[model samples]
Every structure is written in structure tokens, then in C-alpha cells.
Target chain A: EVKLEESGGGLVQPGGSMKLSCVASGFIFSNHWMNWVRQSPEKGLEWVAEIRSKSINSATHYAESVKGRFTISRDDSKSAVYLQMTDLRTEDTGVYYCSRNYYGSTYDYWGQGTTLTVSSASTKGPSVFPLAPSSKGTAALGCLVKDYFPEPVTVSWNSGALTSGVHTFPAVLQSSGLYSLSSVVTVPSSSLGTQTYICNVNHKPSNTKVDKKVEPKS
Target chain B: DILLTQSPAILSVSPGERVSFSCRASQFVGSSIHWYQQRTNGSPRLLIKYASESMSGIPSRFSGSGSGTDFTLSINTVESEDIADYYCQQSHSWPFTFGSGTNLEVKRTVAAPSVFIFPPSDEQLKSGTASVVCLLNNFYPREAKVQWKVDNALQSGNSQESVTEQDSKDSTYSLSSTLTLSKADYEKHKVYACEVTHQGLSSPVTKSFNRGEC
Candidate 1:
């Protein structure tokens, strides 16, 4: 007879809004920290952050540290909290978990996870390949994910100096109503390419970046 | 609780064959060996632990032995119905480490009766042909699984059909599996395996050998 009731109300449209909840019944909710974790097909948990249900009234913990469209909402009478993530995208499709973080950020008690899948939308982009790795080579940057709905993701290539000779790719609509882009340019490199490259993606408030070491693996 | 190192790849096997396995620890693991079975993307199923104690629902054919650093897992007679990757994990340590895996394959072999061969072969009858056994040392009774594999295949026989559990040192059951092979496979191939599976762990693990003869 162990049950944890969760909110099953509302619809999250392609560009609409949605809210979800996790209500525990077996034990008192005050004895633990309410932490949220997300898991996607592409990767494991990318720790979203945590909120102490026992101390929500006090300002002992800052809210700014909790990244992305993540938020914490609770009701004392019900002894439950609703974790909300806004500005949905296809990349947001996955299962999310709520748990009590034990000592040293270790998760002890976990609630049955809640899942959300972003509706596929239109995407614009060129091609990304031919991106050079040399310090002086013209590198093309494009975002092309196979036959799938794409979201409006902001991309930025920052290589310290800002004046580095890397071409910025433009956005194009994919056949599947998504958008992506890839720009190709020819810039030559002299010495063995020992430089840093950054590809940053912005899905609104949540941004993920992947760093590629310029040196090629032989 | 002794920590043992098992092989990474799953050794494939057929039904009706005697499968063998071993676990060799850095120091002496002193009979704290256990075994488990896990399929791809699935939770672990406890087999045998401690020395030869059996878990409920688990087959009886699976047995364990070995004191100090050396241990063994044996299936008296393999059944075609058992097909999955087995692993051996040491519950003796925090941040427990598991052996890579030994793939247990169940394919129609030789066209023998091939059905669920009930009442696996008697393990006690195995005289000598390169044997390895599991034993429970200082740590007993908690939760563990110890089993045996042939090549890398999990043996399915009569014993595994009706399994029982025994309380050893720490209210735990010591499990083991011994593999018996022809003089040729034992001497010429110089290869044997002992697999262990335990509770609270992710997968089953194993130990392989290449006997220089004898």
C-alpha cells in the first residue's frame, strides 16, 4: 500500500505551458531535501539542483544557483512540491526524478520519476562538418541532427580573442519542420593545431556547451 | 569479504555441458565470493554466494568453493534455457567493482532432447579435472550469489531448478560453481572459468584460467 501521488493535470503544447507535481504519502516530507534530476536518451543525469522543503520559508539558500527553467513549488498542507521546467524543446524529452539528498549530495530516498518529452518543432540550420581544427583554418559550424523536430537553439562560438578567423554558419529549415545550419569556410593553419574550440548551444535559459580539443586523435 | 577479479567477456556455452569458473583476488578473499546474473539493461538476479549456499528460486546445480585468493563456480550440467551475461561482484567493499561479464549463450546444439533437462548432474560426483570452489570466510550471510560458467556460458541443469539457501558465517550464504571438463579441454585448452554473483550489485562476474596442464 505504498503510494506516491503525482500531478496528472495539464497539457504541454509545442509552444504552450505545462506543470507537474510529486506528492509523497508513506513518510513525512519534512525530513529530507527535495532535489530534482533529469535523464535523457542522450546522457545520464545532469544535476538540475535541489530545494530544502523543510526550510523554504528561510532565505538560508539562494535560488539563483538552481540553473535552467527549473523551479520548486510546495504546499505544507499537502506535503508535496511541484518541479517545473519551462520553455520546452525536443531535447527535453526524458525522465525526471525527485529525491532526498543525503549527506554530501548523495541521493537516498527517491520518488518514482516524472517524464516529459518536448514536442518537435521547426528547426533551421546549414551543415557542420569540414570544421577545421588548425589554429589558422577556416572552420565551418553547422547544426544538423538527423530526421527529427528541432527547437530554436541559440549557438555561439567563442574562442577567447573573438577575432579568431572562424566562419559563423547560418540557420536553415530542416525537412522535418525543424531548423539547423552549418557554415563552411576555408582558413589555413600553420603550426600544429594546439588551440581551444567551443560550441555553445542555448535552449533559452538552459545552455549546454561541448568543448573539442583542436588536436586530432591519430 | 574478499575482492576477486573476473573476466570481461561472456563465454558462450551450450546445454548439457559442464561449465566452470574461478575468482582470484589480489590478497586472500577467504571464501567471501558471490555470483549474480544480469541481462543487458536489467537488474541483477542473485545466484549463489558465500561458499555453496543457494538463494530461493535459484537453481541448485550452481555451487561455489575456494578459500584464500582462489575460488570457483560450477554448473553440474548446462541447460539450453539459460542465456544471459553473468557477472561476479565483491560485496566486500564500498563502491563495489564488478567483473566485465561472461556471456551465457543458449542455442540448439547437437539436436539432443534440448528441453529443460530437469535435475542437473550431481556436482559432488565430480572427482578432479581442474576444479574451483567458493567458500564463506569472515563475512557470511548478508546477501550474495556465487555461480559457475562454462567457457563464458551459464550452465542450466537440474540443481538450479530447485534451489535452497544456507546460513554461513555472517547469516550469509556462500556460493560456488565447479566446472568439470574432459582431459583434453582441461589440459589442451588450459582454460576454465569461475563466476560469482552477489546482491546489492549490478552484474555477475567471473575468473578465467589457463592451466599449463594437470
Candidate 2:
């Protein structure tokens, strides 16, 4: 039996990691090799790597680095396969597919694809300008948060009633777990939009906080 | 079930900013690293070699810039498509390994990703146009073939092709072959393929194109 489930989905902040599982069933796990491949949106498939019952060796050295993220051991009889990924990024968004190379050649059989998407549009946007602007008349500024993993996050106008709600979207992690998100926000020179408009991100483990104060050109 | 990890998870960038990442070996089994770029719906483009080489057709802004147990795939400019994702694979190892990956994200300004044109050119597939395009570039010895394929099978074509070469300072010369197919013959053909002959290598590298789309 072949099985796959995502850790769920959403914004995967820069440097943040998320874990998911792929459990294999049926057939003797020792005799065959289990393979994982990634498909970006509608692009061609990428061979992630493979594992045999006896050895944990990988086809590529980089893939070898991803090891331990997936702990492959069998249940008593050694009949299933288990796989996982950690340290997520926006680039990690994609449909991850798993297959078995039974004949020791190409992967002839594969499991249903798992859709994994990352977003950046949470409420979390990083702050760079440190000091909030004051003594305003009318000012325009650019607020940026770099490497927002798990793309498709939200930006809110923190001042006045004019606040941008959190934006939601999806991302693919490919076979590799990289992901990204970038967003922007604007605040006018009014008391209504007076409070600092902050961009926030929400995910697992914890969340990130980034703030910016929009001061007018008084 | 190999667990791949690409650290730093998030790679922040501004316009013209450069970034790099390394694909490390978990257990030391000698292997080569293969880097690829995955854009929206485009095919994975091979970038660098663990052997410290480059693939033709790639922009200068993008480079493999490093080697050995540690390798760095670097980009000079952070384009939108470049923002998608980047992966590293080790071909020298047994099961083969891929770096979890490093996502390049743009800050302040998010430039739109470039559009890719594919399926060969319509003019090349036109009836009577004897077109010759380089399927793969820079590989030496030029041992590849261009074939016509229809449905799921290969098809025969009536075309004359030629080969040319130029030596490079790096010891490797650029080699390529040209194929001339009649528009009628190409129109009738459902698919066209280019096969390269690299001696000692078991498989011939092939680049296939669908005629209907062109």
C-alpha cells in the first residue's frame, strides 16, 4: 500500500521548517526502492531520490543531505516506507509524488500526487526602518519583507479603519523544501491610518512579526 | 525515503542581489551534483555540474560558481522566475540525492516571471521549411540524433542534417548537428526528436518536440 499526506499548507516563513509524511504499504519493503519526485505546478517531474530497505544511500549527494528528514524503517516484517521533509520554504510548494522501483530500474508505479502550497501573506511582514515616522503631512514609503517562506501572505494597513486584511494563497515546495513570499502595504497621513501597519505571518511552531510606521511629509 | 534538508529556508533578495546555496552529502558516497531551476510551468533547466562546468543556453546572471564537497549555485540577478525554486542533485551517489532546496524571494519589487516559448517554432514545423535548430548545445563529439515521433512512437523523416564544431579554451569544444525536414514531412509527423551520441554512455540524450503544438 502507498500513502502520502502533507503537513497541511500555508506560509512557510523564511528559514522555518514544516514536516509531512509518506507511508508505504504492501509488498516486502526490503526488496524494492522507494522514490520521491516533485512536480512544480504544471511542469515536468523531478526525481527527488530513492531508498532501499537495506541501505539509506541516495542517488545524489545533495539528496543525501536531505536524509534524516525521512526516517525509513519497517514495521516488524518490513513492509512499508516512511518519508518526511523539514525546513520548509516557499519553493517547497508543489505536488510531491512517490513511487516504487521494483525491477531496480525506472519507477514504474507511483502514488497519487500530494499538493503542497506555501504562502507569505500572513499578518507578518518584517520591519527594517526601526523608528516609526512622526511629524507627518503626507508621506509615501515602501515596506518589504524578504524571503517570506510559504508565499501568498497578507498585508494590512495598520492605521485608521483602513486596514488590509490578511491575504491567503497557496505554494508548492517541489521535491526540495524551498518556498518564498513577498508583500507590500501603504499608510496615508491620517489619524485613522495612524497606527503602524504591520504585516504578520501565521504558521506552525510559531509566527513572525514585522512592523513599519508610515509618516507623512509634514 | 531520504530526508532532504535545504537550510536557511528563506533566501531574501533585492533587485541585482546575488545568492548562493550548497548541496551537502549526508553520508559520504562519492557523487556529482546536478543543479536545476523550476519555474512556474517550465521544464527544469539544468544549471551546473559537480565537475565544475556549465550548461549552454543558460544566462550569465545564473551560475554554479563553486565545487567539491560544497557547491554553490549562484544568480547575479533575482528575476521573478528565478524566484520560483532551485534544487541540487548528486548523481555520483547510489540512491541519488537532492538538496531540499533554497527559495529565492524578491523584496520591495516583485518582477513578473518571464514567459517561456516552447514546442519548437511553428516555422520549423511548417511544410517545406527545412529548419535546423540546436536541440542541445556545447556537448562535445556531437553524438545525438534528431528524429520524428508520432503518437507514443518514433517516426521516420526525410531530412538531411549537418554537424559543426568549435574548440574552446576550456579543453571542451562546442559541437552540434543540424536537421532539415520538409514542411510536409514535418506536418505529417506528430513528434520530432533529437538524439545525441555520447560514446560509452548507455543512453542517447533526446530532446522531443510535439508537432501539433508547433
Q: RMSD, model 1, all Cα superposed?
A: 25.2
Best by DockQ: 2
Q: Candidate 1 lDDT (Cα, whole model)? A: 0.44
- In terms of lDDT, the best-performing candidate is 2
Instruction: Supply DockQ values for each candidate.
Output: 0.01, 0.02
| A63-156 per-residue lDDT for model 2 (tens digits) | 5445544343333243444445566555666776666654443343456656666544444332222112223233223232223334444444
lDDT of 1 by residue, A42-98 (tens): 643334555565555511222232345656666657877676666655555656666
Output the lDDT of residue A145, model 1.
Answer: 17
Worst lDDT run of 10 residues, candidate 2 chain A, spans A165-174
Estimate the TM-score for candidate 2: 0.32
lDDT (Cα, tens digit) per residue for candidate 2, span B108-131: 422111111123233334433434
lDDT of 1 by residue, B7-53 (tens): 53545455677886766667654555556665444334557666456
Off by over 4 Å in 1: A1-3, A8-16, A55-68, A121-218, B1-214
